[PDB]
């Protein structure tokens, strides 16, 4: 009986091995999203409210987000669902998934910390991970670092130094949707091609109408 | 699924045909729409060649044309009063091409008033230009006093998602009025 507990705030997670039934009956019959607290589960966690979202049973089947059963059943799974990755465009497979309501069958639960009650866990706030990637889009960097539209956002893009061969040439990410004279020239080229084509069609039609009104003059 | 093939459907001599060529997707049929009235619900069907059909279920409004003054107002379908193929469609008010329905007639009366100004059913001299020759008929206006105009569906709701049609007029209207005063 294991507990994969994750702290999304600032990034963290770790696993516990709760080997007593009395201190884990607080999860039985809870399906998804309940205020199961630290004081209710074990002495160590206290004031920690666990968002109980997912888990795996013995024989390794994951949980299904909304099946609402205490056993495992077979579903025809599709593209945009959990527990299945389609190996081919349009593929669907009948896979046995485990229900949403927790019980003893679960070999491991998956909990999300949503409230901090008392003394921090040693893998909860002290040790934290950075965000692996900074924003890539121009407006994403603007929305991140607060700078407004007219701020010339190509300067403080988060970088990374590679201590590999004593040269450490920083790999700054390319930014997309950036307002650039190349894109402005592409826009101008398209919006000028359109009017050029329209004028060409108009003059071709005019001269053909001239030909018609000339060859109609014969009577 | 449903197949439109003729490999079943025994030959004209009456012989039962042997089977080959397990059902092909290019011969498939599908389920009828059985378009009802009210609270528009249209489902997109993916058809051959990547095209799309629109299965109308529960259609509420249709575009109906008078065809004598050429207006084609958008109006509400009240119900089905006659269907030449199945009385069950009349019973169930199933919207379908060639169904004889009743329409609101209010946009048509409003257009008649804004056009002729001649008190149909109860920029100055345009009514004068559209002169006294405005008498429509003795059966298309008597329905305006009840606010229900007999119309015939012309689109295919199960195919195009729309329930457009035209107002009954002349000998068509006389035919359907005879049918209605018989079966009603």
């Amino acid at each position: 009986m294991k507990l994969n507990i994750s702290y999304p705030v600032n990034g963290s997670q770790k696993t516990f091995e709760i080997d007593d039934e009395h201190r884990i009956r607080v999860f039985f019959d809870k399906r998804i999203g309940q205020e199961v607290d630290g004081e209710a589960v074990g002495d160590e966690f206290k004031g920690y409210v666990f968002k109980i979202s997912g888990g795996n049973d013995k024989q390794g089947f994951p949980m299904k987000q909304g099946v609402l059963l205490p056993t495992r059943i077979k579903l025809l799974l599709t593209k945009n669902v959990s527990c299945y990755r389609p190996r081919r465009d349009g593929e669907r497979k009948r896979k046995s998934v485990r229900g949403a309501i927790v019980g003893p069958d679960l070999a491991v639960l998956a909990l999300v910390i949503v409230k901090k009650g008392e003394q921090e866990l040693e893998g909860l706030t002290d040790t934290t991970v950075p965000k692996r990637l900074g924003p890539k889009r121009a407006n994403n960097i603007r929305k991140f670092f607060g700078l407004s539209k007219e701020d010339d956002v190509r300067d403080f893009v988060i970088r990374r130094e590679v201590t590999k061969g004593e040269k450490t040439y920083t790999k700054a990410p390319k930014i997309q949707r950036l307002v650039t004279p190349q894109r402005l020239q592409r826009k101008r080229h398209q919006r000028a091609l359109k009017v050029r084509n329209a004028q060409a069609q108009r003059e071709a039609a005019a001269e053909y109408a001239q030909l018609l009104a000339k060859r109609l003059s014969e009577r | 699924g449903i197949s439109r093939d003729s490999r079943h459907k025994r030959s004209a001599t009456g012989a039962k045909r042997a089977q080959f060529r397990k059902k092909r997707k290019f011969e498939l049929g599908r389920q009828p729409a059985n378009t009802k009235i009210g609270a528009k619900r249209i489902h997109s069907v993916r058809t051959r060649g990547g095209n799309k059909k629109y299965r109308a279920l529960r259609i509420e409004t249709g575009n109906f044309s008078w065809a004598s003054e050429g207006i084609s107002k958008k109006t509400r379908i009240a119900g089905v009063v006659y269907h030449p193929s199945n009385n069950e469609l009349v019973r169930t008010n199933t919207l379908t091409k060639a169904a004889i329905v009743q329409i609101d007639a209010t946009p048509f009366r409003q257009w008649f008033e804004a056009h002729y100004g001649q008190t149909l059913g109860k920029a100055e001299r345009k009514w004068a230009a559209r002169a006294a020759s405005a008498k429509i008929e003795s059966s298309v206006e008597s329905q305006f006093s009840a606010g229900r105009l007999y119309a015939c569906i012309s689109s295919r709701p199960g195919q195009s998602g729309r329930c457009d049609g035209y107002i009954l007029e002349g000998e068509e209207l006389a035919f359907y009025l005879r049918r209605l005063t018989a079966k009603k």
């Binding site: - | 459907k9 004209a12 003054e69 030449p84 193929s85 020759s133 429509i136 002349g170 035919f175 049918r179």
Partner: protein
């Protein structure tokens, strides 16, 4: 056709509108066409009151395939006959022929009047029934 309006639906040619506003002469505007290939549109088709959406002159079908000739052997269907098409089939081993025939179901417009006998000319049209792919175009009541 003996009270042409004998169906549950109103029988009419599509998009052929008799405007009750305009005071035209006939009041029953009737569409017809020239079928092509030198088949004269009959006056029964021109002036009748039948509808026959499968008529080659007043209907929505075209004659665009094979032109065949045959002998009418049945007129027991509604607007459909069966023509017999006799021919001789060559058997090379005997350097001789054998009589063969093929019945062909054909749609006959009310423009024509056809009885048993009555060698007819028929033109291919789109499939208009399970077995019918031909429309009578010349009655030639021999």
């Amino acid at each position: 056709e003996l009270t042409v309006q004998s169906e549950r639906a109103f029988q009419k040619q599509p998009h052929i509108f008799n405007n009750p506003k305009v005071k035209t002469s006939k009041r029953t505007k009737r569409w017809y066409k020239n079928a092509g290939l030198g088949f004269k549109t009959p006056k029964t088709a021109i002036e009748g009151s039948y509808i026959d959406k499968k008529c080659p002159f007043t209907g929505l079908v075209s004659i665009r395939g094979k032109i065949l000739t045959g002998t009418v052997v049945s007129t027991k269907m509604h607007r459909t006959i069966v023509i017999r098409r006799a021919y001789l089939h060559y058997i090379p081993k005997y350097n001789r022929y054998e009589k063969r025939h093929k019945n062909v179901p054909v749609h006959v417009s009310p423009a024509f009047r056809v009885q048993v006998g009555d060698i007819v000319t028929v033109g291919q049209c789109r499939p208009i029934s399970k077995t019918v792919r031909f429309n009578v175009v010349k009655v030639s009541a021999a």
